[PDB]
From a paper:
Meiotic HORMAD proteins have a characteristic N-terminal HORMA domain that allows HORMADs to adopt two different conformations: a closed conformation and an open/unlocked conformation. In the closed conformation, a peptide on a binding partner called the “closure motif” binds the core of the HORMAD’s HORMA domain. This interaction is stabilized by a C-terminal region of the HORMA domain called the safety belt, which wraps around the HORMAD to lock the binding partner’s closure motif against the HORMA domain core.
Using CRISPR/Cas9 gene editing, we made a corresponding missense mutation to the htp-3H96Y allele in him-3, where arginine 93 was replaced with a tyrosine (him-3R93Y). While the closure motif for HTP-3 is unknown, HIM-3 is known to bind closure motifs found within the C-terminal tail of HTP-3. These results demonstrate that HIM-3R93Y binds the HTP-3 closure motif less readily than wildtype HIM-3, which would potentially limit its ability to adopt the closed conformation in vivo. Right panels show the position of residue 93 and show that the overall HORMA domain structure is not impacted upon mutation of arginine 93 to tyrosine. Therefore, him-3R93Y suppresses the defect in crossover assurance observed in pch-2 mutants.
Residue numbers in the entry: 19 to 248, 258 to 261, 278 to 285
Amino acid sequence: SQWKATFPVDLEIEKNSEMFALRYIKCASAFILDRRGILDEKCFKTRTIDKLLVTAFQSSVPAAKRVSSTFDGLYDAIQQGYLREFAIVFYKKPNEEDINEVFAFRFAYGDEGEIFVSLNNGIDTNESSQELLQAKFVDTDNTKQMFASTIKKLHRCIKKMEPLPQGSDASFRVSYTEKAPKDYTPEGYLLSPMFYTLNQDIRKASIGIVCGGHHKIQMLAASQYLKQDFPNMSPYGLSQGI
């Protein structure tokens, strides 16, 4: 039930920061997929992290084990400094380009300096990239508190969303840093020329940035199901694992 049952401590250390970064995106993904109704409810279990009720995959369920396992190849992508963004996108087949909702996790490594703002795809903006640059590691306890604050804000955002359309589809999409080789593909993902693009008028929400010592992870959302821009108290990649 304590932090250390789920996440590393001593987050200033590179290996602990890496492991935290991967476990964090997996944790938030389970929270999101459960609350938005993507998989059957038996794919999830509620767990406790300090004062918060969070969600985990139930790996004894095949569909959950499949989704959980997609994260394994992202660990090497994070270790090598190759993962720039992990995004969960919701759409309706057959139109895989028409993104109704996205939850994006953008990474900054060490003190990278500045990061290119994409002009034609994604969710990032000049403002979001400035916020990611300005965020800084402070200490492990502070990251415990910022995790809690961020999950609470994610919960409040999702409470303001209308339900996904019946039978929505979901995919995981990833983009890479300039260090990654030209045809880089994490295990479990497929190489794709396509990422995702959003409509100019979609409503957006900035949920928060959590930091390990060597990794900063920014969560940004966009949805047609938010009305306006926005208890749990105790060279791209594609995965169609969902």
